[model samples]
Target: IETVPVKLKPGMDGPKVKQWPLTEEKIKALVEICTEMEKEGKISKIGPENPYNTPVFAIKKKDSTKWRKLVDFRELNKRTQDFWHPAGIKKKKSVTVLDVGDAYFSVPLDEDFRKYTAFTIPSINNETPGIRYQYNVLPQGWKGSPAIFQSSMTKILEPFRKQNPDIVIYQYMDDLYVGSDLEIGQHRTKIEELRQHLLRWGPPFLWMGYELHPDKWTVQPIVLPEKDSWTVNDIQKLVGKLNWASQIYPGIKVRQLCKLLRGTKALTEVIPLTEEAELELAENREILKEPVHGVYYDPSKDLIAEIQKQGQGQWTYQIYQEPFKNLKTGKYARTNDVKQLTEAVQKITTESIVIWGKTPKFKLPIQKETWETWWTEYWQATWIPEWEFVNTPPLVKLWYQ
Candidate 1:
């Protein structure tokens, strides 16, 4: 059985408010809990402790490993290179955008790994394959791959920068941030030119896969309708193409419009939310309620027994409707003794749909014991814990002795 509360006006105060200040003992207990967790090796050690920087080497046959010979560049750096700085360095009034749309590649493996004869032949197949024969090889721990990619992108942008005296292209690793002194119209034109340049510089080059929010993507300002005239549909339409140059005016409602739509469903499509947006949305979903309350009272011996078994000490709890059955009869039993009960439950469920609309399925929180067990198992699998570090290097310090 569930009881619902009556809805009130926007400014009306609720009856169930509580207030309390934390005592010093409670605060000290919280700090002690944190200290105990740290002592238990649940957290990493703090500063003055230098972390181990040992480079773990990949085990590979010497003959098969195509390791690049390290060349000394000290002499090359001393040699003077051509001083070719392009003139007329102007303030970057234009935005240079390079979107690398999900650039991914397969690993380059040794030919011996695929060759049937490499493994079969005794003397000839002594050396192992150069690369790991695996799917979805993550691009990391490579020495010169990043530098090579960066240099390639730099070469592609260099020609355009040299031609356009007002523009300056700045690249840091994968990110390309371009700037020019051109006006709004000229800036748009220059951006198109840069896009063309990127298209020409094919392969290994890509754009950022994610689309920018409508409000942040364009230079034009958003215009909002009058408060009296505005509707939900109007907000939805604005969110759809608020970034397009045709949709928005240069200096219209702008900031005021943004504030009105902020944090609402209409604004999420346009607004660039921070990392906490999902968490905030989840919290909002929990608090939203219908305008009216209804109840569905079910009185069944089996349900009462099951509820009593599970509830134990708790006064309020939930049980799914479909799974409720009589234990003795071993069949589905209708708990709605009164005709009004079934009707009320259905009405409340439908009204809930109107109030909050679509909602995600609820997930149960992990038990404290389960969470602790999961953490212990995870650390045991991945890392050697502090308790097992007694004889390890640097663990037994001479200063302590």
Candidate 2:
């Protein structure tokens, strides 16, 4: 398939940088990784004369002693024309996850643009300054990598989709989730069939950052264990995870956390946790510990629209299915099916909702003349869209804020 090439914004140039300092162990890891990549023809040793150079380093792999090589692409990413494409599974609970090996590297880079991906690594001994290298294929950490790879996979997997019209395949970046409602025996058969197709063309306990549970269709956010202290990067990562988790896990307060992280000077800067921040961190974890029931798409359920007033003029809205009992688990929970359709927010102007022509913001109804005057002034002061004020006969009405 003809994959989309990396395209930078016009009039933008790649950063020319020297290799960042590394520890002895990290240098060794870099040399080892570079040699492996060189042998596999993924990257080639280049002269130090390239106009662009990004630093390369090795990160400690999770749950392992191995180090995974990474290229710092923040500078390059700022210049790349980012593609916004949504890639994920639809609403099937039964899923088989497949990972595309060497996902980003599988797509070839445009020859002229490969120079912009140049990265420098220090020698194993740190005696010589550094050696330069560039990727023959797309590099990770670039903003455009995911969209480019996904577009390629969609074209590459066209034949499989055509053959198995009954099967549903969802691609998110490099991971593929083949979902169906077939029996176990037939599901296994489809998975095996997919494996063979992948030789030509790519969860499980954890899928799309959520740990899927068997009963109640429950899912929990998969976050790394908390640490006593953290880097700005750590806080940013936590915020990203919590933002997604908040879709299902209600009442998750992340505003303060986001502000704290946003206030940082640099991503790698060490951040000392304040007492308040420490509590906030633990509070988020506690909320995430609660199981979130997944709501599958069902045409028969009654969908209810819900709205609430936030602080000042801000308002939030949600659409959830009526409370229903799960046939298999015998439990009652709200089924709010789709993500894009589930939650939304509409912000009125930040001006307070106040009663005009009344001295101290009257909480009770007033005379007809005063009420009419208040409505006229309030409507002029407010810029609420798609809303209107109605006059109705007064009754003994109870009001709640």
Candidate 3:
């Protein structure tokens, strides 16, 4: 599979880059790989100026100390035609996701697009000032490469859909899942099918950035060791694990707060929770991710119309429907008028139903038992998504003016 050429936005040329500070250790590791490849005639130095350039970030591969190089493709992604993922699991909760070993590199790039991917390496010594080389294959971190190989893999495994019709084979970039309601002999068949497909498609294959172990994608409880001190790094890992859980179960408020702990540094920092902080974080036994606050846009509407189209008993759909309904009819807030649209929608927030006097203890007409559960869901998901994100309590925003 060859990636689609580097297509830019109509007025734009390419990504704006910020130089990354690479450690000496990181550069030495990269130079070795580049030298080996250049010796093998895989790379040749080209002109210094290029239409596109990306900065490199290094990470250690899991279970190994080997450094993996990363390229920032945010600017490229803005221009490329992105994949509208034609994939999702059947709601069985038993999902079988497979990963490719070297996903994008498994395929080649369109020749026209290769030049746009050229990146320059800085000089280490007078041995060479620098070298610029572009990938011959569909390199990782290019905007348009993901959906290209995923669809190709789907075609390779298409026959398996007929063979093991019971299982649903779904691919998200390089991650493929074979989901089934109950374990028949089909999971084995699906594995064998993949084995054969790679046998044909191999000498080659792939994966993505999340830096997760594909094998451990599903939930399996761990017994954390008896309480010792936690480092900033430990808290960072803990936050990520909680994030994965929250995706599976979206009701956890504390897990959402845990996300705020990411990116902070201290010496064995024991970040304290506050009263302003929802007590839910500490009290909740298991961590689960909160869903992306609310209202997924309407592709799933035809797939599950009731979930999309039906109103929740009354007037709440007024807010949810307007932004999206106009979106569907080809009406949109232009670049200049977005704030106005936001202001128009902001009008809906003044107490939907209220009694005379001061807030009436914030209780609903519904019974106490149901209200406790219902109110949490309502407060966190529906009511919150309707408004702009303001008044976050005491947590620091990662950026400022």
Candidate 4:
């Protein structure tokens, strides 16, 4: 049975796990990292009775010797619903993004809750080893982990916001972007003030946080390894890396190639094929130089700022319609057109009939009397036929005109 927490949304049921691919590893390095984490109480041992499970797929960063192990939490994070974005924004041309360092790992998970994250680790080789483990601290893959982490981060920065009102903070989990849209000098001083303030979080967050590295995409062909060796989880890992590669290289259509791998989701919720994820399974050649046919763009938010600018006559106006009726006559009026509006005022003041251009266009004189206290003053404003009325002018009080 699951105990409900405030963090979890109501009626949430998570998907099943417990099954995974071989994702074999070199025991020498794997055991060392696992043991240290287990000792740190950041992860724990899971026996047969546990109700939660995800898979392990070790990954190698593209073009580097640095190795990292990943647990597939796709299913869990799905059910573990959660958001911490920006309050107000610091609108500016320079949009800088910062990723918090070790985002999930930094947040401590509750002792009772860590059980939902247990995953099995089979012995890597023919040699001696034991069944592997579960996470203690907020593991990267668990659904609630990022929200828990970012919530804490936001709280830490909250006091800083009031104290240093100059700097604005925006966040998506550990990723942060801050700069000045106002006086750069103040944003400059606010920068230092903001820095030391986040327990130095507001400042260090500017420096911290990153996993999905865009710069890695600079490589040419991040060639996929032996397809047969790949499990569904493995393909997703490559799909993600290639996706960002596709992002920075907008002309590169490889992102579709990335999406094509989503069929793997039918299996495990997770990474690359290989005897080796680092060196053998996934490898990069070069960022390709493909010939462009015409203008095509890979999908991205940048398209937002990519405006279709045209001449607004140097005088742009917000044009809209606001329907008004004769308050005194208690008439049902309509049409926010300039001509119709002028017609209504004319007919009401003359106490003459108005023929239909439309609803209020058909608005006729409700009474022969053309007078009221508020109506008289309001009509005077509309009485002047502004030259730009063809573009639609403000309506006025009439019928009692």
Candidate 5:
């Protein structure tokens, strides 16, 4: 019986792309950010640096007949005719529902497990002086350091799941996707639960400027719309539902919905917008012009229809042209008039509040009572160098600002 060679799958390609090389710039930035955050009382400082390191390995294939010499790729039994069917081929579903909460950490292996090894003999016939050479398995420098960081993070989060059952915490490395149903009052409560859980993890939680607020979140079902697979029309309906929810729940950022619909023009045709929807969409677009909150806008609609037909070249000119400028100016002028009207209404409301004998609660002067109590209880008592409580389990330390 002839044994055939195993071919590599596209997904099983070598892990060369994911490692990041340690550099002076990265080290300096990490140190500076950590120091700044420590000074702000946001995190306690650890004394020693935790340098991460793992071991490396190699393997060589042995010949079956004599078991004396190693077999190279060239000598592996080859049948020119395709004898093996593709091993792992399966029908792919149009939409894949990724159960992120169910994902667990893969066990970390020694670096040696990843090293490549070479087998060589002075002559194919000689076995006496055979040589085996091996090199590093894991890449020391590449773009995938975050992958390793995430692997460790997943392990840490797994044990904390029971303590944090109320909130769903899904992460792709440092990027976290937290979500909850847009039901009134429920969103804020759920977010607070997640915040407290993360805060328990100490410095690592503060190191990453994680967005923890409820308003910064979005919730979309795990589904894909393609043809023969899923279709754009299917996705549009999802977006429509999200838009309706947004109307009911004010201040929810639905930017991702805009992004998902941006690339599919034909799909936009199926879901026509109302005049009110168009104006609201334009207002959303205007808000996006700000650097802090710009989202990709689809040019598929009639308002952006010309840009869809042409490329960005024509779109740029259209936006800068006279008629467009005049229209924009008129819109801004109208918006200013509305703002003035709003201010007048606010003034009237304020006057009414004053006449109603509703005295404003006078804010007490900064008494420092809370600060003094905290300083005496936690910091001054525990953090001071000469304090006997300095060695406590949750010991406090004064970080230089």
Candidate 6:
């Protein structure tokens, strides 16, 4: 029932792309997968009359040799209109994570826009031109795919969430995590009952690759093969894995590795593990030695909003956690750690400016005189009486201003 329309920006159309050279193995895989896709009615073999065409490729599925066909939609996506939607969530007492298998395929793509999803599959024989096809269902690599998928999923789960008000339902695109205050047995029974109504999928104890436990979630410690010199690709892989771990273990810093990466121009570029970079990796490995503790958000606890500013007028805030864990001592510190707070403020401000363009809602003031009024207005909108910021130096300076 959830069908998404492919919306292109006005006068924007994707230019035709020629098929990339494929090995015999890749050609065989593509032919097999595309044949099946055509049979499933997921895609159709189209005549040359279609206005748009894009190259397609195959990638191996997680832990499986089977290839999943994907269109290289980068060009088409750049010309596609954006679909903005609300979605994300969870931690436990008891949490059951549900992943919708082939979530995008389940959503019906708009009939009118099917031609826009056009792609080509290279023929197995050298003599023939590749076959052209377009998707009838919502395809991967489109910009609006996730947003459209999430919107449809939200509608599907709306009734169940409404009926079970006590259970916390968090839907992020294809993955859904249902949290319950009840015991595991009760939680299992609830999910089982729901399965009878409609459901099926992935590991019962994992969410987004992290193992979930009753007390906390955890990431597997990063294991690297014993080697001397590292290539740019090696560092990139390590950084990628660490970034994944950072979702659960926020302490793992990749700043030094990122710095090293900045110097290299190509993936094949070889770099030495200098003392500084080695120290950073060693620190990360030490942090991962023990299973990184996942932070649990207690909805009942007071949310403290800590705001900070930086570089050419940028601002950001984090409004979670209290009596925070001292990473080194393993004790919950009663007071806010000034050093930790300051680092977070600076880190968040710069990252937000780089990534999100600007912090949400509020704008940074251009004139020094308006700082007071701006601060007053921002606090009035976001202030909660319980939140207390032990002023960082920049904040104190701004306060005086």
Q: Tell me, by TM-score, which candidate is best.
A: 3
How would you encode candidate 5's per-residue C-alpha lDDT over 1-401 as one tens digit per residue? 21112333333332222112222333334345435434643223222221212211111111111101111211111111122211111111110111121111122213332222122212233424322222122121111222434544566567556664533544421224443333436654544555555555521121121222333212112122223322456546545544543442344345544554666377535544445544554454444332222222222322110011111111110111122221011001112322332222222222212222111111111133332222221110000110011111111001000
Measured by TM-score, how close is model 1 to the native structure?
0.23
Q: Which lDDT value does model 4 have at 95?
A: 28
> After superposing candidate 2, which stretches have Cα over 4 Å from the reference?
1-6, 16-23, 59-67, 83-90, 94-98, 101-107, 123-126, 141-152, 165-168, 177-192, 201-401
lDDT of 3: 0.42
Comparing candidate 1 with candidate 3, which one achieves the higher TM-score? Answer: 3
Give one digit per residue, the lDDT tens place, for model 4 in 243-329.
544443454344334444545366564344223333322233234223212333222211110001112211111111222111112
Model 2 earns a TM-score of: 0.44
Per-residue lDDT of candidate 2, residues 10-121 (tens digit): 8888878666567677778888888988898888888757878887666554334556576667677768875771112233445565545366777777777788888887
Ten-residue region with minimum lDDT total, candidate 3: 351-360
Q: lDDT, candidate 4, residue 329?
A: 26
Residue 252 local lDDT, model 1:
18
lDDT of 4 at 370: 26
TM-score per candidate: 0.23, 0.44, 0.47, 0.39, 0.21, 0.44
**Of 1 and 3, which scores higher on lDDT?**
3
Off by over 4 Å in 6: 1-6, 15-20, 63-66, 84-107, 124-127, 145-152, 163-197, 200-401
Model 4 TM: 0.39
TM-score of 3: 0.47
User: Arrange candidates by lDDT, highest first: which order?
Assistant: 6, 2, 3, 4, 1, 5
lDDT of 3 by residue, 380-400 (tens): 001111111122222111100
Q: Which stretches of candidate 5 lie over 4 Å from their true place?
A: 1-113, 116-160, 174-203, 206-401
What C-alpha lDDT, on a 0 to 100 scale, does residue 318 get in candidate 2? 28
As for lDDT, the candidate ahead, 1 or 5, is 1
- Per-residue lDDT of candidate 1, residues 304-374 (tens digit): 11111111222111222223221111011132122222222222222122212111121122233442223
Cα RMSD, each candidate: 30.3, 22.9, 19.7, 31.6, 27.6, 19.4
